[PDB]
Backbone:
């Protein structure tokens, strides 16, 4: 359909409330929406990082220039209906910068899907599920605060699973916070943790069993991202399911973790993996090796959460559901359509190509680099 | 689009000339074309085996009943535009019978692609290549015969690569046949062999280096299909590229071979792997592990060769090309359209959904079980 | 003795009561009895599958054609007293289809044994035992129902061991069903489970220890058939005895599991292994590696149960007994002779060649393909 | 048939010419024929060792007492048609002494076969071959002598393969003897060596490749019997086929060598393995692992060579033939029937149960302990 022009703008949307992790506190969330105009029909997509260049090596300002100045040129005037070539071309243009690469991928995928009148889900082969159990993260520094916000979410019938962010406290203090949360939300809720790399193997070995004894069903990224050998030993010595998040990056790293089953669950993240096409391949090596598939997020807006939803509904199985709470933690949206949770599950949209139209008005209100 | 009815018929088409392998001689080639009618628009696909229940555990008669009596029922009245569910449903219906499962998959994939006006290639994400270097197999029992047929194919500018079928002779006699073929077709042609499991490791160890010294670039399935450990030792002790064909079956077996690099190249075969969707996953574990991808055939007709072509054009790289000579060895076609080779390469079709319309007249002429 | 003709017919016999497994519910049981006539004396044998093409890739209709159309031809007019050649010949005729191959094997083995006036047991070298402890399976969906049927079997003095079929329930619900069965039948009965591949390693790792703590002595096929690497990790991390059932197939797969002791017990199944001759070899690699031997069934009729009995009595040791309840769950027999249980043990027959004469009258009553 | 009495006598038969090995020179060959009388029909079998207690830990005098005083008692009055029990009973009576255990096994197997009118071959399931390529061993100390005896054997059309006994010379002198034998008998004959454990790994590593370059197709037991780890390294570093002879003993040692393919070929020896029943199991673990099967001898008389022949004809494949030259090197026989070679192959007998009747007259002439 020949790409006329690929434009991109940065937009900063604040979080209703902070999200204190081990690596950074999320007071605001920056993005990069990529509008790929072609033959009259546009294609929206987005790419961004957490805590700037902290969760990953990318950030809002790096995403923009890598897109505009390095990917965009080689993509202008190219067949818009050829994602195979778009991705190949993007790999010969820049190294890494998966968020930037994924941002552009979404747009071409969205546009092509809309031109055919189908949805990203129907394009990938149709769904298998109409809704995926969403998890809620309790990352505020207060224990009482957490519990209260947690009890209400079970009442409002939207969140049955919980993801506690440990790490900012001492290994001995986080365990106590878990004795409290596990005590109250005992059987009424599911519990998971995400140490955000804070634990140094030894601390992980003595503390993982304790959390295991408290009924925690999944421990995400206990040790550092590169210590994939520790990630394995912990996995063989503990019955708990250990998920890889920061360690996952490229298709090769996915296979590297899957050889000796260094991990139990792969956390699928489009921006951390290079798009939808890249994620599917990792979900393929995970299925072959027998590793479960999750469904993470970079606390991305609706534009992202929607595309990721489309793709996750096509996965054979997500034994742990997902955590697409991006729009729900954000203080505002950049589209006219909202994603609605119904009975602890996030419902899959009913439109063509991630059924979300960018709110030009909402795009104009924030638009800062930061 | 709601599946009205899924019909299937058996058709026996002879080979212009025999294809003597290590396991069987191919005098004729039996098939099973599956016409899935839905909302007025049909969807053609096919599934079959080599030498009956010899290359695989399946055969023409087993494919028909497993399709009609076991897969078809659960698929009638189902959303025709949902391959994700179709495959899932087929896995909960029958075990194995990948040719039968792949036959039906093709049809739904074809139909859906035609309803959208795109091609199977554009559906999977668009091509990366417009033609793939086709290989010619020299499986006749005569050495002089082989060489003559080989020289003409280089002259007619259609076949630059050659696949000699060894195995029916003694290990000492096949080597001589290779001293002759390698001598004449020295630099004007590429040489590959396919022992069809005939060699018992030890014979493979002493004979593979000899063939290696004769300039043979690829040795397909030297040992038995199950002796995946021998397949590995041969691979570490020889520089030649060793390809797995019979050993490849399920996504799990693909990963099993990819862990310690038991093989150099994976031979992609839709009927042996369960369709297009299944093949893509194996092509994913191969890419992650770093194993090259080939592109085999079960000497299937145009209906098959066309779908496989659509999919192979989407693969990032096929360092050894393909061997889609199905229509070219066959004595007749079952469609109005022919696939044409141009300059040693098989060209990718220009229509919607494997651009091939079944010749009802040609379907009627053969139609025997055999 | 020169084989005159090998005939085969399909017969459908219902189950007194359903047998709900993880993969399918058994309301009826289809078979394929192979009558090999030769020099006046016949030889009966049988081959069939569970849930059609679900437990294995074979089913009633596939068994018949593979037998009649592919094995039978090459066997007609051949020396009936040469099983060595019969099997070799069958391997060069078709690939896989072990149930079909085993059906024919039984018949030639039976006939040859009858012509010598000895029994299959005496032919294989004489027995070591006169009876083997039979296990009873509790596969009905009701917990109370199970327990009641279980208590009566201990009273009637026929069943001391029990095999609970888990899988159709949630991992959390099956454990409860085991808290009940283990509670009542505590010391008066032996307990074993068969997850039928339902558990995905991680679920198996947390749940196997729980069942272990409930006194369950054997856990059959926890994970999928192909995930033989998970089967190993579970084995090293748990004291419970883990048995392989679906993973076992060919002699090669048997050795593959025996290398690093991926399993504790091999489940011997004639139809799943290719006959009596094939089973003996697997029982040989199991003895050498130090893996225990079981003695399974495909809920086959008397014809099968009898031949399997003959062979199991020759095995050096069966630490877990067998589960030849085929005739006992069936609603009728196809022979004049019945197999009788006496004091928790299934007794070995007292005739020549599986001492069972097909009831032509009973063969005529069912005979449908289904 | 109830064993009345099991008798055994020692008989010393000289070798026409000496057989100088690395461990001992064979000027004479001692035996132990075991006549098991039962219900009027006798059953002949034999057991013995090479160089007395040198090849193995057994010898003529040890075989007799272990038989008479330890196995015989528990076997008297037992069901003669129950080899399963006979072997089991023998294992609970004495430890090791496989030659003694095998001697008795042959007799019961022979008797049972004769009572049924079939042959040991037909009993085991019928043959697959009517003759097995016999190998001739050149063990005399003279090089010229060897070559002459070798040339005549090719002329008389009886021996195409040759087994040179190395070891008694220096590693540098044996190689020369091979430059001579390989030179003359170049293409007219097959060459194999048997170092009889003389080489100390390092010497084996430098010298095996040299012999390999001389066209030697098989190198039997290069290093010591216990250094099964050296046996493996040599195997991975050399294309030549390495056979295990002295290292093979029990079913467990067979599997131990088959795990990591420490050897290429297993040498089957009834006396070294505990009989026919034991040999079959080793031939089972060899088939599963993919190791080739040979067919050795302890230079045993006709009684032995005949039983071994019966069993080898039932093996799926013997890629290297056998070396049953026992009767042919001996200076006389202990039976009325002779085994005849016809066209480089040793023919399988045509009688019931090893078709050989002990020559009472010939038994009386030698009968010394020695
Ligand atoms: Cl995160
Ligand atoms: Cl092929
Ligand atoms: Cl079962
Ligand atoms: Cl020897
Ligand atoms: Mn995380
Ligand atoms: Mn092939
Ligand atoms: Mn089972
Ligand atoms: Mn030797």
Residues:
């Amino acid at each position: 359909m020949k790409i006329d022009a690929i434009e991109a703008v940065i937009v900063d949307v604040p979080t209703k409330r902070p999200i204190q992790m081990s690596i950074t506190t999320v007071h605001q969330q920056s993005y990069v929406i990529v509008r790929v105009y072609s033959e009259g029909l546009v294609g929206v997509g987005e790419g961004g990082s957490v805590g700037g260049p902290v969760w990953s090596a990318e950030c809002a300002e790096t995403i923009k220039i890598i897109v505009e100045r390095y990917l965009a040129p080689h993509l202008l005037g190219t067949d818009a209906f050829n994602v195979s070539g778009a991705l190949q071309t993007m790999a010969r243009a820049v190294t890494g910068n998966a968020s930037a690469k994924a941002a552009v991928e979404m747009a071409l995928l969205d546009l092509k899907a809309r031109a055919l009148g189908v949805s990203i889900a129907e394009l990938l082969g149709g769904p298998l599920r109409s809704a995926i159990p969403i998890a809620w993260t309790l990352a505020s520094g207060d224990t009482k605060r957490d519990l209260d916000s947690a009890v209400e979410m079970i009442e409002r019938r939207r969140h049955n699973r919980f993801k506690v962010k440990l790490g900012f406290r001492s290994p001995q203090d986080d365990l106590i916070h878990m004795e409290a949360l596990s005590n109250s939300l005992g059987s009424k809720a599911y519990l998971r943790v995400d140490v955000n790399q804070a634990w140094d193997e030894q601390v992980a070995s003595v503390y993982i069993p304790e959390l295991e004894a408290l009924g925690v069903e999944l421990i995400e990224q206990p040790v550092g991202r590169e210590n994939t050998q520790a990630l394995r030993r912990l996995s063989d010595n503990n019955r708990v399911a250990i998920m890889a998040d920061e360690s996952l990056s490229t298709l090769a790293s996915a296979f590297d973790l899957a050889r000796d089953r260094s991990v139990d669950v792969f956390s699928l993240k489009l921006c951390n993996m290079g798009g939808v096409s890249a994620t599917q391949k990792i979900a393929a090596v995970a299925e072959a090796s027998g590793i479960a598939s999750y469904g993470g997020t970079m606390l991305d807006s609706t534009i992202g959460t929607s595309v990721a939803l489309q793709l996750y509904s096509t996965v054979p199985s997500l034994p742990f559901g997902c955590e697409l709470i991006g729009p729900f933690v954000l203080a505002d949206t950049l589209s006219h359509e909202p994603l609605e949770i119904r009975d602890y599950e996030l419902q899959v949209p009913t439109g063509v190509g991630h059924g979300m139209t960018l709110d030009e008005d909402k795009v104009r209100q924030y638009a800062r680099v930061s």
